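Submission sheet (multi-component)
Chains listed below:
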Amino acid sequence: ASIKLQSSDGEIFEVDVEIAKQSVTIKTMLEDLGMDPVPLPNVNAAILKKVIQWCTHHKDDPGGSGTDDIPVWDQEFLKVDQGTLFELILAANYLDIKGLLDVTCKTVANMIKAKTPEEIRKTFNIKNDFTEEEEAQVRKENQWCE
Amino acid sequence: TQVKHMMQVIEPQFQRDFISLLPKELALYVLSFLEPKDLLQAAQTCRYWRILAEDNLLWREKCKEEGIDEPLHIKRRKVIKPGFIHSPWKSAYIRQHRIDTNWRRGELKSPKVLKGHDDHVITCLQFCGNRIVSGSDDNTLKVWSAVTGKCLRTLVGHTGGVWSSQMRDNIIISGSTDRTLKVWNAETGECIHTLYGHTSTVRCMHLHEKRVVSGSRDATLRVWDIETGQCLHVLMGHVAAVRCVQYDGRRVVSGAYDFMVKVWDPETETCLHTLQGHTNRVYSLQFDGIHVVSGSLDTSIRVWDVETGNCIHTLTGHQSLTSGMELKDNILVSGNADSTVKIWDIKTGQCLQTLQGPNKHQSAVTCLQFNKNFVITSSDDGTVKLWDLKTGEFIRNLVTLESGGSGGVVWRIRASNTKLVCAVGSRNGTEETKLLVLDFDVDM
Amino acid sequence: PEVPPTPPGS
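Outcome: structure written.
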């Protein structure tokens, strides 16, 4: 069957019940609270199209989890820019969609492993806000090998 | 609230980065997908990331992964800059990582030298907390401090050479050619009991909880209560000398110069299984409750199932006597007169590594220890070597006796996480007998 | 070739 979601910015989405119920948030508001349509104040139409697209792809992907190797399709699906990834994390959390949260978060982690402090800055922006003294300490305290 | 306190108080406002701007749960969730090497590099990015990366539970989990069980609490503070709230689990990881590093590549500090047993052999060695016990064919044992190198006591009593020993914090047990065992108070040095029953040398023993089992050149074993000093049971059935024994509280396993390994239920003094197959003397033994593993002069090592008595694996490829083996979670490490050490998976029979190569031992291996990272081996070549258990590669000589090729030998070793203890000496006066104790702790 | 120390026989 099909059910109605309302994005934060007022746009309605017709969704297959079994794909939508991957969001525990939606499932709850649907089954326990009987909301029709389901209003999602923290998710606009844009990211909500992407969330539904992801769920639709994994509507059978029986979790399963497999946290280890990030699927090929998902990796292309997040060739997306930094802003969007950030929203996808927030929407996955809001909507409670464990698979999407995990994937998107691993994807950010991967932008960290294993660069040097400096290379992590040139990726994430970040100003070195340490004094001369502090940076001496941090380098010393977080020394790897030697 | 570590993180809450530090954010609210160091005040790292206006960063323009991704993870600074996430809810903090989600920033921590992201950080959870990283290995420690990366966490330590992330921590050097900026104040904010540093505060996040120093989260206590993130590191508790990282520690449980390396099997680090206690957090570590430091003290010298300072209050250096504006306040930082260190994670005990984090500094525990880092402690362990520096210790590891120190064993692999840290400058070799001059070891403490504990001279004793002049002109005699150190036949057994025990190391428990900060106490070392050396036993000798001079008829004595000495108890030493691993911390200071002082000899604390000298256990005189046996009228015969000491050849076996066990220790559990403050109880020491010794076995001698004078045909007895003795139980001792380590702190005071008094002999609390003398155990009669054997008629010939007490060659091996194994202690579990309040009972020791001894094996003897008389071909028997005896099980003894350590508190009462009474001999509970007598195990008769071997035909030649019992050289090696293991006891887990439930079954005794013994190996003898009749080529046999026997499995016993002590309470009923009954031999449940005679494990036959070795075509020569059995010298070494291990047992984990499910598997018995026996080393022979046959050059074979056999693995057996205690429950049925069936040979599961006959592990081959050593060329001479397997003198000592250590077994831990289905990994077996064997040291051999052929100068080689091997590492085996006893579930599969796979020989995972053979320790050799250009820095191989030149002569028989006398002893060994291992953990999930290293093997430590000793030899009559006068070295103690550190090897990488995962790659099987030589790392370095921890000890290199100058007299190594003229008579100096390392008879045996014990190691803690932090310390290595070596019994050393010679049959010709080229190396005075003594223990060497090396420290790999780090300042922390 | 070489075995470890062992107690003297009788």
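Remark: Residues 136 and 142 of chain A are 10 Å apart (CA to CA).
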